[PDB]
Amino acid sequence: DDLKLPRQRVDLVAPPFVHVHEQATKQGPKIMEFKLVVQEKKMVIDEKGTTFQAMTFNGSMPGPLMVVHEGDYVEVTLVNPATNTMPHNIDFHSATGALGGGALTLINPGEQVVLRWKATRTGVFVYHCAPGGPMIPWHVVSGMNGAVMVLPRDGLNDGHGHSLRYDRIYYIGEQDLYVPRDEKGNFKSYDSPGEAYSDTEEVMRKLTPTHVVFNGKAGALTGKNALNANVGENVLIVHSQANRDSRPHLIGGHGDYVWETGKFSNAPETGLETWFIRGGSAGAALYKFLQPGIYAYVTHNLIEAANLGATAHFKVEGKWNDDLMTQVKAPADIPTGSTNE
Amino acid sequence: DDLKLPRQRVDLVAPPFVHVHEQATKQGPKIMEFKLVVQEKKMVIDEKGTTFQAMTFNGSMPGPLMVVHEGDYVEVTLVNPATNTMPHNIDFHSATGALGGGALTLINPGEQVVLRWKATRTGVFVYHCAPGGPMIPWHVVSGMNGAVMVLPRDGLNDGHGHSLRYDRIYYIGEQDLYVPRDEKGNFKSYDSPGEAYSDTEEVMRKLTPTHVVFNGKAGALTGKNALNANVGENVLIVHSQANRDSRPHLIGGHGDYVWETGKFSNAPETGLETWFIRGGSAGAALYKFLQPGIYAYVTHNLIEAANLGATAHFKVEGKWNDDLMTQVKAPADIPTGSTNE
Amino acid sequence: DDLKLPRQRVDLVAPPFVHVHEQATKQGPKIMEFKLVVQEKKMVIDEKGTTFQAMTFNGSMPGPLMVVHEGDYVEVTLVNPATNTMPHNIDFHSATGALGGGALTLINPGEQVVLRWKATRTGVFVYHCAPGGPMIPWHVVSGMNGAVMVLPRDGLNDGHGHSLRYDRIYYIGEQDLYVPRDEKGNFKSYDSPGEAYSDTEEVMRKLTPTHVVFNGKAGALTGKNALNANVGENVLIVHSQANRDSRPHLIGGHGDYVWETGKFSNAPETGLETWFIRGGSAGAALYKFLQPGIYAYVTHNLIEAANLGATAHFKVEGKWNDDLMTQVKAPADIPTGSTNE
Ligand SMILES: OC[C@H]1O[C@@](CO)(O[C@H]2O[C@H](CO)[C@@H](O)[C@H](O)[C@H]2O)[C@@H](O)[C@@H]1O
Ligand SMILES: OC[C@H]1O[C@@](CO)(O[C@H]2O[C@H](CO)[C@@H](O)[C@H](O)[C@H]2O)[C@@H](O)[C@@H]1O
Ligand SMILES: OC[C@H]1O[C@@](CO)(O[C@H]2O[C@H](CO)[C@@H](O)[C@H](O)[C@H]2O)[C@@H](O)[C@@H]1O
Ligand SMILES: OC[C@H]1O[C@@](CO)(O[C@H]2O[C@H](CO)[C@@H](O)[C@H](O)[C@H]2O)[C@@H](O)[C@@H]1O
Ligand SMILES: OC[C@H]1O[C@@](CO)(O[C@H]2O[C@H](CO)[C@@H](O)[C@H](O)[C@H]2O)[C@@H](O)[C@@H]1O
Ligand SMILES: OC[C@H]1O[C@@](CO)(O[C@H]2O[C@H](CO)[C@@H](O)[C@H](O)[C@H]2O)[C@@H](O)[C@@H]1O
Ligand SMILES: O=N[O-]
């Protein structure tokens, strides 16, 4: 064993939640140990019950958020159980060399592999499967993508010498899906990913998704699964898109501090309405809630948001601030003496 | 009346022009009073006379630019005359709470509502209708979107302690439209927005506009309606797109100072060729004209610019500067002694 | 002759290579003389041998990279040989006035023209043909676009007072193509550009390319034409896209310093995973290679990368650094005592 550092095992949690971590740390570098198990399975992706043949890390779309600190080593055990049908691997955009690790991690069903990469670059980054050739886009748009956050050891800052600390963190993975339709326009079902491939590839080629979803399905983060917050809390929202651009917006809020390219060596932008996640990247926004109520978090192509699945909700508890906004007069009949031309 | 500030009524003007305002001000905060009247009407959107069932604020696409200063309060009377067929509301991306105001402003035909929001965030911002669900994209891509500018009280600056002042301002609202076609490819006409909806939604779902226009129609800002300027003038060009990305470019010019994310707390970028307006945002560019003549202002997807409607012109008066550019030799026959392989 | 500066003739080279130049210079301003010869010709654009009716500067897609310094004058002789069928011109996004030069450079087959523009703006910039109207997008998506780099006279810097110097430079021109298909889905062939136009325009209108290629064809920069580098070298990668957005990513690497909007008066961003070239612009990234092996350089819409042609390779010589990344355990059977749920 050449590398003589303490080891720490991390238990991942399903998105949009994030495993326990420290923001700032005075611990030295560690070997941070993670396990990812590939799971191919049929999943429900919309509110009408449409299914499709997904491929996942750890059973979720997105794959879980991994969080480490600058200078840590990340030792990932990737497992491809023999119930799976395809080979898989992993490419970390946070890592240096061998196609992000993909060239060192190709495993057949029944195999596992252990990759270590040094976390030399701060930010949020995509990770994704990339077996080779046309299998690269297919595995990614089938769900095989997640993100990793590499925090500075002193935690986040505003790029102007002031520390920033979040009260809460959520990870929003956005997924573009390409579900085949029959001649009548109904979504087609298949018994395996391999059977779905040819028809799926034809949809992929036209670069227009059938669905754009957060946390793996339309409505996943609405209703009973809305994201909780409180007035006053500084919330970090990490957003990834491994294949296609997105334009996040918090309806009724702002991005107080936004790293749209997602890299903490760059000062954030302030007071954004809408930001831009380039396909193949993660970004992050901090917002301090000022008002209670429901907020919609969307990609601000509103067709994608409302009609293809890409809306989440926050439910924020606290007291309303009438100075920031008030209904001066409730809806009422237009006065008879009005002229409205 | 809890809020004891002076009130000022603003008369809006149709785009691309902007109502009278001060850049820098020493007045304290005011309650700035605006009126927006929803108008559903058939409108001509291209040079072949194609019509479509539009929905507007104040009869225009885009809706008018509102201009206030940081710390002002904005009291908006939204009116939905009883000649309209649908409910409408308004979401200000500049505002904090209640989905930007949409949750406090839903009005049926025959009603009006009064919303007040504090202008706490500087920049240019979209405002748009957002009734709920699939009606959100439909009302926005039918034309119900505009912008508001919240200036710093000291006016604009270059992010490096130098004041910037514009001689002229224009507001370019870009609109993506989704007009149904019949089996022969001809655009379909309808008698009401409700009748157009189902067919329109089908076009919307494929995320490919039929038209991309400035100021509501192909050719709106060309010919006799070209934008005027003079050599030496510093012109602010505000650009909004409430649903879809755009990439503005001034052909023959530059962006001297560009806030592509549109927020004045961030230093502008300098000397851009082309900039990027993320769907769901406004941005702004300053340019000091150096040469007279015709300039085309486009989105630099040139197919959209030339073939789907997204070109404006500036006509700039003044004297040509042969140091910056000259025709050394006019077109002439290729010399006989030339080799051109 | 009013302009009394030394003249220097530059011999252009085919992309992805770049003509000999100095980074930093103490020479004063010069008149830098370039020749571009339009060539319309059928070209092979994919690995199955698909052809299409291309239009080029100097016989290549992209056109060659021109490199000058701030304050130089650029005197371009544009030649349209009489074997061509169409008029052509040139618009420099680096230039000020007359639609970038397009309004001074329209030439019929059999003619040439000489344009001079002052290089007042630093950065990488697109140049492209723009005859007028619908011919603008058609000539650009037929291949008539390249880039020019205007270096500061002191060479590049990190925006924080430190000089940056590249060991190598490559120019990656990305081209979106719109090749017609017949009723069976096979790509159609034509005998001239004029014959291809009507069918091509119909594909263009739907804003979905059939191919997205680097250096004019799928596979152009893979295999024997991979880009060479060595561990330790700082490589500048200039990327242009004259019509459509792109999201470059170096698989297994990063962008150490990235000017995504492409203009050297703005500090670069650091440590990017993926960056964004807005359609109608050039950008640039510096990366110091740290690991040997194969790197893929893609647009990170992976469908475009793997299935529509947009992948290049770097082959990097040197010694592997096991500290940055190592395969701890090669692929092996999942242990019997494992639980992987
Ligand atoms: O700022 C650019 C910088 O990236 C460098 C920093 O010295 O390195 C990055 O990658 C290296 C991998 O070891 C580390 O030096 C560094 O800690 C990390 O951001 C260079 O390659 C260069 O100057
Ligand atoms: O979208 C085309 C066409 O297909 C139908 C079924 O004929 O609906 C399908 O497509 C809809 C939009 O994606 C989905 O809402 C639904 O799950 C699916 O069956 C038609 O209703 C539609 O006109
Ligand atoms: O810079 C981030 C900053 O936004 C803050 C500023 O203190 O507030 C913004 O929203 C508030 C609404 O009252 C105002 O304080 C401020 O004037 C405006 O930009 C915080 O929520 C935070 O530090
Ligand atoms: O675009 C398809 C097809 O439709 C036709 C009419 O059959 O033209 C229509 O579409 C054109 C492009 O949008 C418009 O220029 C025109 O207003 C519209 O009728 C065909 O000419 C075209 O081939
Ligand atoms: O920084 C904005 C700046 O651009 C200016 C610089 O003074 O000019 C640019 O274009 C001019 C063309 O002569 C040059 O002054 C300058 O060297 C170049 O970047 C103004 O128009 C303005 O302040
Ligand atoms: O893409 C539709 C359909 O066309 C066919 C020929 O019928 O293949 C063509 O399109 C393919 C994808 O672009 C190309 O790979 C090939 O060069 C082209 O002939 C079908 O195979 C495909 O199903
Ligand atoms: O070593 N201190 O947390």
Ligand SMILES: O=N[O-]
């Ligand atoms: O299945 N995804 O959260």
Ligand SMILES: O=N[O-]
């Ligand atoms: O590993 N590819 O299916």
Ligand SMILES: O=N[O-]
């Ligand atoms: O303002 N949100 O769509």
Ligand SMILES: O=N[O-]
């Ligand atoms: O109060 N002065 O404008």
Ligand SMILES: O=N[O-]
């Ligand atoms: O109708 N719009 O300017």
Ligand SMILES: O=N[O-]
């Ligand atoms: O208010 N919706 O049609």
Ligand SMILES: O=N[O-]
């Ligand atoms: O350079 N304008 O397309």
Ligand SMILES: O=N[O-]
């Ligand atoms: O004039 N010196 O290179």
Ligand SMILES: O=N[O-]
């Ligand atoms: O033909 N282009 O490199």
Ligand SMILES: O=N[O-]
């Ligand atoms: O010059 N146009 O074909």
Ligand SMILES: O=N[O-]
């Ligand atoms: O990580 N590259 O696709």
Ligand SMILES: [Cu+2]
């Ligand atoms: Cu996989």
Ligand SMILES: [Cu+2]
């Ligand atoms: Cu990747």
Ligand SMILES: [Cu+2]
């Ligand atoms: Cu409405």
Ligand SMILES: [Cu+2]
């Ligand atoms: Cu909005």
Ligand SMILES: [Cu+2]
């Ligand atoms: Cu041409």
